[PDB]
């Protein structure tokens, strides 16, 4: 029962960028020395929407077979117990639950992991008393928080600007990616000298906000 074991990403979820070459982890732990030729590995993908599972890759001890183009599990690594699945240029529709099934007759073990595919926002700041437009494009998922903040010499602590700022609707693109633009109207007459402003973009694909500097002049 516990002479053969499988371990997936801690946390149960892996996140990867669109078009990157992701590696879904699957580690084997056997009570005996691994003899890859007498071992079998199978990877399945299950849609989180349709709840239907498909075989994605199979390792028959002395030869592999990929059902998902480019899919591979390197043999020279499987000996170290690494049954991880490499998927070249992953796509948005490939997000889902992946399952790694290991067979070392008569023992069998498995594990599942969630793969999320994300696209980082491309934020562009452009100038039209002063209309500013911040366009962040090509991001996935849809949810995205755009904000504006300013730091005056008086109060250098960044404070959020929630006036004269209109954040437009998020439009879906053809390649499944998303778009959104936000506009801020600044009046020189009302602003302090040398204030530093910035468009702040928060999104799941970012570990820290994507900022864009600018000062009136």
């Amino acid at each position, epitope marked *: 029962s516990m002479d053969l074991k499988v371990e997936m990403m801690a946390g149960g979820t892996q996140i990867t960028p669109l078009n990157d070459n992701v590696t879904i982890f699957c580690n084997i732990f056997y009570s005996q020395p691994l003899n890859i030729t007498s071992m079998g590995i199978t990877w399945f*993908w299950k*849609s989180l929407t349709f709840d*239907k599972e498909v075989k*994605v890759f199979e390792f028959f001890g002395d030869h592999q077979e990929a059902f998902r183009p*480019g899919a591979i599990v390197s043999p020279w690594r499987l000996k170290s117990g690494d049954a991880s699945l490499r998927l*070249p240029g992953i*796509q948005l*529709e490939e997000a889902g639950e992946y399952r790694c099934e290991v067979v070392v007759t008569p023992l069998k073990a498995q594990g599942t992991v969630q793969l999320e595919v994300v696209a980082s926002p491309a934020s562009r700041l452009l100038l039209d008393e002063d209309k500013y437009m911040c366009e962040s494009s090509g991001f996935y998922p849809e949810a995205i928080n755009i904000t504006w903040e300013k730091q005056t010499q008086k109060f250098p602590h960044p404070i959020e600007i929630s006036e004269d700022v209109i954040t437009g609707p998020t439009i879906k693109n053809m390649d499944g990616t998303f778009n959104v633009t936000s506009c801020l109207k600044l009046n020189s007459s009302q602003e302090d000298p040398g204030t530093v402003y910035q468009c702040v973009v928060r999104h799941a694909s970012l570990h820290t906000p994507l900022r864009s500097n600018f000062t009136l002049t």
Partner: antibody
Amino acid sequence: QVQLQQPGAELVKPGASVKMSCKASGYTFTSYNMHWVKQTPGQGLEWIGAIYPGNGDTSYNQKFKGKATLTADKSSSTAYMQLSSLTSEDSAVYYCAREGLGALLRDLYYWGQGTSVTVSS
Amino acid sequence: MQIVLTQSPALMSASPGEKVTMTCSASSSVSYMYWYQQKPRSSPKPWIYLTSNLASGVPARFCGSGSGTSYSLTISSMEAEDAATYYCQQWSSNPLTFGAGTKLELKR
């Protein structure tokens, strides 16, 4: 948005060769399998094979090995299929098709308009 | 182990409004069956995938089902625009194969 452009038709001589082109656009050419399907009134739809532009991996229908060869040009996002030493039996429409991924793995979702090939003297 | 798909009947007639059922029998078991629709002088269109999911744009009157070696495509209520040829396709093992298709015509 995903588009697959194929020339309308080709008139070819018996014994000759021909290269069918398929201009792909609207998506990452190297991340999807490109398939080719033969269609003649007599045998319905027949699979020729597929190629993963990205690492060039191919899968062929045994009946076409030695007859068809799939290649790809990444720089131009174009799939190609070559038929060697043609005979009238090769006269048919040859479709270009993109296989999806995920819920659409192994499903030919997008098709080119097809190139009608006529083998004749 | 080439899997052969046998579609029956080869030709079907349906009056507008009638229920239509076409089958696809596979020589050996298959994980999933896919269907495509094709009208004269144009390329086939994905109609059904993963055995029962409709491709975007396909009318809800269509229904696909099946298991193992036996599958079917149904039309609750026939319509003129449904007259076409339907093919099943599988790829659980090489080579990918298509059924000979079922030509569905209008009945009169």
